[PDB]
Amino acid sequence: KVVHESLRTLEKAQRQLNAARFVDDNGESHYKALQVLVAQLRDASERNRT
Amino acid sequence: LNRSSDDGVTQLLSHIEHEVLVIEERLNELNETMFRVDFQPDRYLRLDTKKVVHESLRTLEKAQRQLNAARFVDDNGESHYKALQVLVAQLRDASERNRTLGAKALLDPRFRLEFAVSVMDRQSGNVIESRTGSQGGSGGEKEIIASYVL
Amino acid sequence: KRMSEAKRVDTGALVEAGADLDDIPVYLQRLQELTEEALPEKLNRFLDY
Amino acid sequence: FRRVEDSWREADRALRQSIIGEQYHRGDIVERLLNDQDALLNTPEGRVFD
Amino acid sequence: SQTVLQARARSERDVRGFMKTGLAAEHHRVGHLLNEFLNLALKLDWQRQMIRKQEVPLPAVGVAVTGIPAIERLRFKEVDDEAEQTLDLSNHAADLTQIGD
Amino acid sequence: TLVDALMTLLLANPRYNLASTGGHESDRDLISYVRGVSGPGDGGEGQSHIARPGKTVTGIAATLEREGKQVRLGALLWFDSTSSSVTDMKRLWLFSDNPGQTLEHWLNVYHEGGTRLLRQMEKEAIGLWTYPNKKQYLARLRDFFEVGENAFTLLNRAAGLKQLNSIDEIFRELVLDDHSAFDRAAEVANSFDGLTEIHQ
Amino acid sequence: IPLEEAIQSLSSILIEHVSQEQYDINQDNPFLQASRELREWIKRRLIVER
Amino acid sequence: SETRTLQKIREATQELLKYGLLEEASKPNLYRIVLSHPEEVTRILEPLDLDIGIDEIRGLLYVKVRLDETPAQDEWAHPLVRRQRLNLEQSLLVAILRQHFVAWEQESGTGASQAQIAIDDLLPQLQIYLGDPGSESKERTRLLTLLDQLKGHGLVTSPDAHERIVIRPIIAHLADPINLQALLAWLREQIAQQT
Amino acid sequence: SETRTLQKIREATQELLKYGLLEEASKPNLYRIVLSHPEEVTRILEPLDLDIGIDEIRGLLYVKVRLDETPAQDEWAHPLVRRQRLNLEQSLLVAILRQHFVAWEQESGTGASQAQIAIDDLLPQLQIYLGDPGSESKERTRLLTLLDQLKGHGLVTSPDAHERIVIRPIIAHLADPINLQALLAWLREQIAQQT
């Protein structure tokens, strides 16, 4: 088993999203974290050859 | 500017074409050797070489002709200077980007003549084949091709 | 010039009008409507969802 | 009959030309439309024909 | 009689419809400009059908691009060659054996 | 050539002539075999290097036996013009448990009629199914043998592939079935597009 | 009258009077000439067609 | 190594280019996709000097030639714009179309691209300008020929079975106040020399 | 708001998209520029699934679909690049010109300036496989028509002032020369058998 920087970063993003939802704001943070997480999703799905 | 001349490019191209000619001559000798062996059960083999003239030297000679025309024209030597400048700047761009295959083509006698292989009729000398590499094959064809050429 | 910039940014109804004083009244109407009707409800839905 | 049609057509083009002439004068336009009567009354023909 | 009656009613319908159309747009921002354009147009001779064929600088909206000239789009005629029918099937003696040293 | 014929029968996209490479390349191909290519020739008009230049038809097949029952697979590849590219080639794939459906019968049927008569032959016959499109052909093949297409790929490359240069590739691609969730992750990412649009 | 029915009848009548030499009534295709002449009688407003 | 743009973005942008415009009610997916990355769209098109306008209130997108680094220009002269410029005969129909479009919008709302007219209604309108050659065959022929040219510019769908047509809303962004004003100016200029 | 691509690169890009080609003989300085900036080019093109193939021997840049490997449809389908299948006359002329280019480079090497080919010899060659439409005038006229069409695809120059023409190095990268040569040999053999 190995947790590559990719999976490590995704789990970091999961923690970040948890953190962002907890903080209440103009939606900037919650949206930001959710969006970067979905961005990792999209990047993986797109560049599935890398 | 009048002291500027084509003497620089003529000697360089003369030496380069001398290298190309030497390559082709020794290829002819190797062909003589290749005329003695038989490659396939019913063929003998020959090597090939053609002459490469790059877009780089094409533009070089276009700029040379336009420079000669610029000497016909007179605008205080500024069109003359611009033509010679484009030419020398292209030369220096080839030297600077020597890595790019275009510059290599512009400077390299090895680039300046391409190579290929062909299969020969031992009986008549006729030809129906020319291979650039060794693709296709059944196993063993590659072996013969590689061994012979190598 | 700023009316033209407004149209350059425009996305909807402002095409009905040009870059002249007569278009100004509609500019103001739309500014009010954006500030009052649009922006708060859009924020409502966005944050809610 | 062939002439009555010409009369209608002439009255039509006249009316339309004029109302292009009245670009902004809603008064006449609404005055025509609100009326029940035909907008193409070329009576010299129309009425006799009727 | 009915022929002329219908030729009348049709034109009546068209003019009433034009009346309704001009009425609403008679003042709307663009509509007033359009009417201005209509009247300036009235002056031109439309029977000059191919000389007032004159280009105006209207905006270029809906500019599609297509038919990009890529060499790959080229393909060559399917020249049918029908020297014979494909009926041959036999196994032949081409599976027979005889070999050298 | 014969091994390549087999691999063509089996796989969607086999590495032809893989053996000459040693396991990492293929440089012959379907149409070359269909047209009997043998070498470059003069490359300007010479048809000697290409044996079957005119309208030609090619067929290959094989038959195995488990528990006495024999399954034969086949394929047909015919051109109708001097055109020398894949697009101008017409296809058939064949899948039969009836031993009587031999390559000879199928070739006879084609001689008797084009693709339409081959469809009619499929209608008439039992224990026979044939497909001009390879997707359905290999789908039926795979739900018949109960081994995924990945299996056949490993089979082909296994014919050669003596290197095993490094295990990681061999296993991850050739051996192991695939269920990486790129599509599923996209699915998730796409559910959020709605929210993104209200945001925008 | 149907347009081409008229073309036909006119071409028939045209050939009848080709003997009127000075007006050079077409011979190689009187039907085409009937068409090229109905064009004229429309363009000259003798016959509106509807 | 590589940074392939979102393949979805590639689909949407390439389609949009293929048609010059793009309508929601027809192809909402690529439409929303471009709505999702209008900046990326723009920067993709920017090298080509092609730029995207937007109309959400009717469900439209479309290209429009940029005007930079060779100021202003007659847009049409750009190499990539693929058709010949509108000509005032077309424009004469264009004005009528726009009139009908705005008139229908001002009573059915802006909630549809289904602004419709029957061909026969146009006939009187042109008849005033292009005159009355007195043969329905000629006038209707010229009418459909004009309409055809316009659908070439994409403004109006071709006739249906019921001799009725749908105005494409892109018409509105053609019959701009600003552009109409430049047009009226140049037209009065023509009047002044015709006299 | 956004920065704007280098004007020269945008120029070369737009030209290359109008004509699928850029050449030392046509825009040689743009040719040098793109050669120094190919990454910019491909980056611009890749959202559209477009990409250049290059030819430094013959001073030719050209386009080519960039789509990836192992597609769902065995052959690529591209929203923009619509495909043509030429009539026999054109295809035959192309094959003729292709083997002409090959012969010229055989005798003169790669990149050697093309010699001009005479309509005077073309009309015979067409006569080899096309018979006669009714006159030499018709032969020459249709030859020039097809040459116009070919120049339309950029594969040749215009009919020059001396009723010769020159070949465009784009020929060096046609779709499938095997299709050309198979057809050419088949045609000559067919006519030899028929006679």
**H32 touching F (Cβ < 8 Å):** yes
Nearest alpha carbon to residue B139 among F34, F159, F21: F21
Strand I21-23 relative to strand I164-165: parallel, antiparallel, unpaired? unpaired
* Count of CA atoms in the C-beta half-sphere (13 A) of A19: 10
What is the distance of C-alpha C46 from the center of its chain?
Answer: 19
Task: Judge contact between F128 and F98, C-beta under 8 A.
Answer: yes
Q: From the CB of residue E2, how many other CB atoms can be counted at a distance below 10 Å?
A: 6
Closest chain I residue to H7 measured between Cα atoms? I47
- What is the DSSP annotation of B90-119? HHHHHHHTTTSHHHHHHH-TTTTEEEEEEE
Provide the β-strand partners of residue H167. H115, H156
Give the gap in angstroms from C-alpha I93 to the nearest C-alpha of chain F.
14
Contacts of H135 in chain G (CB under 8 A): 42, 48-50
Crossing angle of the two packed helices I136-152 and I88-108, in degrees rounded to 10: 70
- The one-character DSSP state at F129 is E
Q: Determine, for residues B59 and I24 on separate chains, whether the beta-carbon distance falls below 8 Å.
A: yes
Helix, strand, or coil here: G49? strand
The Cα D21–Cα E39 span in angstroms is 7
The strand order across the sheet containing I50-55 reads I21-23, I60-65, I50-55
Q: Which one of C12, C18, C23 has the shortest CB-CB distance to H57?
A: C12
Helix, strand, or coil here: A16? helix
Counting every residue written for chain D, the total comes to 50
Containing F76, the helix (H) or strand (E) segment is strand F69-79
In chain H the first and final C-alpha atoms are separated, in Å, by 67
Q: Determine, for residues B59 and I59 on separate chains, whether the beta-carbon distance falls below 8 Å.
A: yes
The Cα G40–Cα G43 span in angstroms is 5
Closest chain F residue to E79 measured between Cα atoms? F81
Q: Determine, for residues E62 and H170 on separate chains, whether the beta-carbon distance falls below 8 Å.
A: yes
* Tally of helices (H runs) and strands (E runs) in chain D: 3, 0
Q: From the CB of residue C13, how many other CB atoms can be counted at a distance below 10 Å?
A: 16
CA distances from F13 to F8, F81, H86 (A): 7, 24, 51
CA distances from I99 to E97, F17, F42, H119, I104 (A): 42, 30, 11, 55, 8
- What is the DSSP annotation of B15-53? HHHHHHHHHHHHHHHHHHHHTTS--STT-EEEEEEEEB-
CA distances from B26 to B31, B48, F75 (A): 8, 12, 51
Residues 53-72 of E with CB under 8 A from I: 65-72
**G44 touching H (Cβ < 8 Å):** no
Nearest alpha carbon to residue H151 among H108, H186, H119, H184: H119
Task: Tell me which amino acid residue E32 is.
Answer: H
Q: From the CB of residue H171, how many other CB atoms can be counted at a distance below 10 Å?
A: 23
Q: CA angle E57-E59-E65, nearest 5°?
A: 115
Nearest alpha carbon to residue D7 among D50, D29, H79, D34: D50
Task: Judge contact between H6 and A39, C-beta under 8 A.
Answer: no
Q: From the CB of residue A3, how many other CB atoms can be counted at a distance below 10 Å?
A: 10
CA distances from I48 to E64, H9, I13 (A): 14, 9, 13
The Cα A40–Cα A12 span in angstroms is 11
The Cα G47–Cα H137 span in angstroms is 13
Task: Tell me which amino acid residue I193 is.
Answer: Q
Structure tokens that stand for F182 in this block: 């790129």
Strand I84-85 relative to strand E74-75: parallel, antiparallel, unpaired? parallel
Task: Judge contact between I96 and I125, C-beta under 8 A.
Answer: yes
Torsion region of F146: left, alpha or beta (phi above 0 gives left; psi -120 to 50 gives alpha): left
The Cα A42–Cα A36 span in angstroms is 10
Q: Which one of H43, H47, H80 has the shortest CB-CB distance to I9?
A: H47
Residues 6+ apart with CB under 8 A from B140: none
* Residue linked to tokens 């009433």: E16
Structure tokens that stand for H54 in this block: 């937007």
Residues 6+ apart with CB under 8 A from D15: D39, D40, E15
Q: Which one of B129, B138, B141 has the shortest CB-CB distance to F40?
A: B129
* Residue linked to tokens 């930079």: H68
Crossing angle of the two packed helices I119-130 and I88-108, in degrees rounded to 10: 130
**H194 touching E (Cβ < 8 Å):** yes
Torsion region of F36: left, alpha or beta (phi above 0 gives left; psi -120 to 50 gives alpha): left
Helix, strand, or coil here: I133? coil
Closest chain B residue to F22 measured between Cα atoms? B139
The Cα A20–Cα B131 span in angstroms is 64
Task: Judge contact between H73 and E57, C-beta under 8 A.
Answer: no
Q: Determine, for residues C45 and F199 on separate chains, whether the beta-carbon distance falls below 8 Å.
A: no
Residues 6+ apart with CB under 8 A from D49: D4, E4
Q: Dihedral, CA atoms, I80, I84, I90, I95, nearest 10 degrees?
A: 80
Nearest alpha carbon to residue F106 among F79, F125, F83: F125
Closest chain F residue to H7 measured between Cα atoms? F186
Helix, strand, or coil here: F71? strand
* Count of CA atoms in the C-beta half-sphere (13 A) of B27: 19
Closest chain D residue to E14 measured between Cα atoms? D12
**H39 touching C (Cβ < 8 Å):** no
Strand H50-55 relative to strand H60-65: parallel, antiparallel, unpaired? antiparallel
Task: Judge contact between F117 and F110, C-beta under 8 A.
Answer: yes
Task: Judge contact between I23 and I169, C-beta under 8 A.
Answer: yes
The Cα C43–Cα A29 span in angstroms is 15
**F183 touching I (Cβ < 8 Å):** no
Task: Tell me which amino acid residue F74 is.
Answer: G
For residue H73, report the phi and psi dihedrals to the nearest 5 degrees. Answer: 65, 155
Counting every residue written for chain I, the total comes to 195
What is the distance of C-alpha B6 from the center of its chain?
Answer: 21
Q: Which chains form contacts with chain F, at 3 or more CB pairs under 8 Å?
A: A, B, C, E, H, I
Helix, strand, or coil here: G31? helix
Residues 6+ apart with CB under 8 A from B114: B49, B50, B51, B52, I109, I110
The Cα I109–Cα E30 span in angstroms is 66
Structure tokens that stand for H167 in this block: 């105005």
Structure tokens that stand for F128 in this block: 């026979």
Q: Which chains form contacts with chain D, at 3 or more CB pairs under 8 Å?
A: E, H
The Cα A17–Cα A24 span in angstroms is 12
For residue B62, report the phi and psi dihedrals to the nearest 5 degrees. Answer: -60, -45
Structure tokens that stand for F75 in this block: 């394929």
Residues 6+ apart with CB under 8 A from H82: E63, E64, E65, E66, E67
Q: Which one of E66, E68, E75 has the shortest CB-CB distance to I85?
A: E75
What is the distance of C-alpha I93 from the center of its chain?
Answer: 12
Structure tokens that stand for B29 in this block: 């000798």
The Cα G39–Cα H47 span in angstroms is 53
Task: Judge contact between H84 and H137, C-beta under 8 A.
Answer: no
The Cα F78–Cα F159 span in angstroms is 27
Alpha helices in chain I, H assignment, sequence order: 7-19, 28-36, 38-45, 88-108, 119-130, 136-152, 177-194
Resolution given for this structure, in angstroms: 4.1
Provide the β-strand partners of residue I64. I51
Structure tokens that stand for I180 in this block: 């050309």
CA distances from E23 to C23, C47, E27, H92, H116 (A): 21, 45, 8, 19, 18
Structure tokens that stand for B13 in this block: 């191209």
Task: Judge contact between H4 and H18, C-beta under 8 A.
Answer: no
Torsion region of H154: left, alpha or beta (phi above 0 gives left; psi -120 to 50 gives alpha): left
The Cα H92–Cα H59 span in angstroms is 26
Measured CB to CB, residues of chain E less than 8 Å from chain C are 29-30
Nearest alpha carbon to residue I51 among I38, I36, I60: I38
Helix, strand, or coil here: F94? strand
Alpha helices in chain E, H assignment, sequence order: 2-25, 29-42
Residues 6+ apart with CB under 8 A from A50: H1, H2
Provide the β-strand partners of residue B119. B45
Provide the β-strand partners of residue I84. E74
Task: Judge contact between H156 and H147, C-beta under 8 A.
Answer: yes
* Residue linked to tokens 């095993």: F164
- What is the DSSP annotation of chain H? ---PPPHHHHHHHHHHHHHSEEETTT-HHHHHHHHH-HHHHHHHHGGGTEEEEEETTTTEEEEEE--TTTTS--GGGSSS--SPPPBHHHHHHHHHHHHHHHHHHHHH-SS-S-EEEEHHHHHHHHHHHT---SBHHHHHHHHHHHHHHHHHHTSBPPP-TTSEEEE-THHHHHS-HHHHHHHHHHHHHHHHHH-
Nearest alpha carbon to residue E25 among D19, H156, H113: D19
Residue F92 exposed, middle or buried by CB count within 10 Å (0-12, 13-18, 19+) = buried
In chain D the first and final C-alpha atoms are separated, in Å, by 12
Nearest alpha carbon to residue H82 among I16, E67, E58, I47: E67
Torsion over CA: E67, E71, E72, E76 (sign): positive
Task: Tell me which amino acid residue I99 is.
Answer: Q
Torsion over CA: C5, C11, C15, C21 (sign): negative
Counting every residue written for chain A, the total comes to 50
Residues 6+ apart with CB under 8 A from I83: E72, E73, E74, E75
Contacts of F27 in chain B (CB under 8 A): 135-137
* Residue linked to tokens 């050697």: I112
Task: Judge contact between I33 and I9, C-beta under 8 A.
Answer: yes
In chain E the first and final C-alpha atoms are separated, in Å, by 109
Torsion region of A17: left, alpha or beta (phi above 0 gives left; psi -120 to 50 gives alpha): alpha
Structure tokens that stand for E1 in this block: 């009689």
**C1 touching H (Cβ < 8 Å):** no
Residues 6+ apart with CB under 8 A from B47: B27, B30, B31, B34, B115, B116, B117, B118, B149
